[PDB]
Structures are given as C-alpha cells and as structure tokens.
Write a protein that binds this DNA or RNA. Structure first.
Ligand SMILES: [Co+2]
Ligand SMILES: [Co+2]
Lengths: 205, 205
DNA sequence: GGCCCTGGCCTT
DNA sequence: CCTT
C-alpha cells in the first residue's frame, strides 16, 4: 500500500554525501570539496538517485593542508582555475535543496548516507560551524553508514570491494574524486535497499 | 561458512555505554557492557559471552548533572560494585582478543546503536588506561541504528527491537547490560533475518 | 592522522 | 525527539 519514501525510513530523507579533505581532523583540516546526492522513490517502491550537487571549496583561513592528504586525492588548493568556493557557499546550497527535497517527500528530517559516515558527517558539521550556518536539516548524530550496511548485505566493509561484490563496476583510480565516490556510494545504497525489497524483506509483513 | 567468513574476518562485539556526559574526552564512563557473538553449524548467529562492569569515573572526569538525571546513576555510591576503567576493558579485551583467535578472525568490530558514540567513549577510555593491543578497529563500526533502518525501517533502539518482534522494557533502558543484550538480540535478528530470505550466502540464490 | 604491526589498513 |  505504502509507495512513498517517507514511509521507508520513518520520515527520514536520506541524502548521500562524500567529502575530500586536507587531512583527518574535522576541526583543523581543510574541506577541499564536497558532493551531495539526494534520493527519490517511485510508485513501485524502488530507490534511485535524484538530484546531484558538487563543489570545490577553498580551505578556511588558518586551516591545515596535510601534504599526504593532497598526495592521496591529488588536489591542488593553489590552482587558480579550480573555481572553488567558500565552505558556507557549498553547504548553504546543499542544504536548501535538501530542505526543498524534504518537503516534497513529506519527510521530517534529512539523514546523511556515507561510507564510514561519521567522518563525512564530522567534517560537514564542523564546516557548518565555521560557516555559522543554521537550521541544518541533517540529523546531529544519526547516520546511515554504507560500510556497515555493506557488511550485512554483501559481507564487505571496503567501498571498493563492496561495490565489486554487489556486481557494480568500480574504478579505483577515479575513486579519489568526490563526485565519483558520491555516485558509486549512492547507487550502492540503492542496490542494497532494493535487493532487500526483492527478497521480500520489505514491507515488513 | 563460519563467523570469520561472514564479515571479511571481523569479530563483531556488541556494546552499550553509560556515561557522565557527551564529551568522550572530558566526561566519565560509568557502565560498560560487551557481548561476543558466535555462529552455529547451520550458520546462525547467537550470543556467545556476556560481560558488564560498573565504572569508577576517572580522576579529572566531568560529571554532567543533566546526564546523571537522565540515567539515574549515583557515581559516589560505594555499594555500586564499581571497578577501574582499566580493569573493565582489560577484561573485555581479554575476552574479545581470545574469541578472535578462536574463530580465526583477524580483529574485532564494535556493534552498537549509534555506534560512534560508544566507540568514541571506549577509545577515549582505552587511551586513559593507556591500554595497548586494542583488538577493535580504529574507526570501523557496525551501526545497528542504520542497519535497523534498512532491515526494519526504524532508527530508535526501542522501536527497532519492538518492530523486530522483540520485547523492549524502557524501564531497564539505562542499564548497559540490558541495553547491550537487547542490541545483540536485535543484531543477531537482523543478520539472521537476512539469511532466512536468502540474502546470504550471496552466490547460492 | 591515528590507531594497528614489525608501513598498512580507509572514510583523506 | 530519543546514542548520556
Ligand atoms: Co569551510
Ligand atoms: Co575510565
């Protein structure tokens, strides 16, 4: 009977997030770029990516830029044509569409979906703080961790191995990029959730 | 088959923690409960061992009134049966580190509701006791809050249990022991419910 | 960067 | 709302 998205996650509005940084310290390390993918649901009850956003962010003044983090993600904060923006700008934009998406869905509160979510969730909140952003539509401590979910559904914790075992195609060399990860992640979630529905896991009976 | 083969070598340990506040660095640990898991020959997941401890707040610890009023724990009570934070963990690690060798796993992974919280607090406790050879993964956790969101479409522990066809007595909700047991039963439930619908093994289907 | 082991896992 |  219940087609809608709002019903599937108690009224939560699952938004996918990945983040590329200049280190592992959410407080002291710079946010270099962030991508966000909202989800949608059809009348058959199937889950699929909806709208997509991504931003290159300029490190908050005073921020650390760990050399290795740069070696890993191959990002250059100094590059002029980076077309980067202020943490505020990205986050401000990401939020407004999420809120807009929540109303449409009939949800009551957004919740971040991410691989090893806390990490990303950690950085976001910290970025909203520096940005003095308010009304944040995300849940303050509740997250959907694709690492844990993949452990249950596929028996794999790594994003790479999870995507590969699930039957997805995963280009590891392109992974470092934000938009690619948020995409491979969003689909994973949808594949995990949807396969669950196929095996008669949902609805609950 | 075997526990080791179910989660790419991880040894899942269920945990609930009772604290003096929300700051893992400053506030105190008051209660810790832990439950290792095993798998029968058919491949069913059930509770193996159970540990619980009353914790003496560490010297310099911060004790939030707001919190204590919520869980109703009296830290100064000498008839508490409290032990040193070091003593509680050294006994858990001792149990966990051995279950891993028994099941041919490589290392442990914390199963908890909103797992980050407990994980944050436990690691901070391990640091205080300057404990070494910590069997647990530095940052990887199975969040039963999210897993329940997939399996049961619920995020709150009590509803996750109730909706999972379980009993949940909100009267005993502030007890690490009761809480953990209710969590392991819910986790073994979700994991097992997956096997029932043929979600696992992956190939067999 | 922050813990495993005698660099290597991972969300960078 | 619901990890203290
Ligand atoms: Co910023
Ligand atoms: Co302690």
């Amino acid at each position: 009977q219940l087609t809608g998205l709002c019903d599937r996650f108690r009224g939560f509005y699952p938004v996918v997030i990945d983040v590329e940084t200049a280190g592992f310290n959410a407080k002291t390390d710079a946010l270099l770029e962030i991508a966000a993918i909202t989800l949608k649901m059809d009348e058959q009850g199937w889950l699929m990516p909806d709208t997509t956003l991504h931003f290159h962010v300029e490190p908050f003044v005073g921020a650390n830029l760990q050399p290795e983090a740069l070696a890993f993600n191959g990002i250059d904060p100094n590059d002029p044509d980076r077309g980067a923006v202020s943490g505020y700008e990205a986050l401000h934009e990401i939020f407004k569409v999420v809120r807009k998406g929540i109303k449409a869905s009939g949800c009551n509160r957004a919740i971040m979906v991410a691989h090893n979510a806390n990490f990303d969730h950690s950085f976001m909140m910290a970025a909203a703080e520096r940005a003095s952003l308010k009304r944040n539509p995300f849940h303050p401590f509740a997250t959907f961790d694709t690492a844990a979910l993949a452990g249950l559904a596929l028996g794999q914790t790594v994003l790479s191995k999870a995507c590969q075992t699930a039957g997805m195609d995963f280009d590891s060399t392109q992974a470092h990029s934000a938009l690619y990860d948020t995409e491979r992640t969003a689909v994973l979630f949808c594949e995990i959730v949807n396969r669950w529905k196929r095996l008669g896991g949902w609805p609950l009976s």
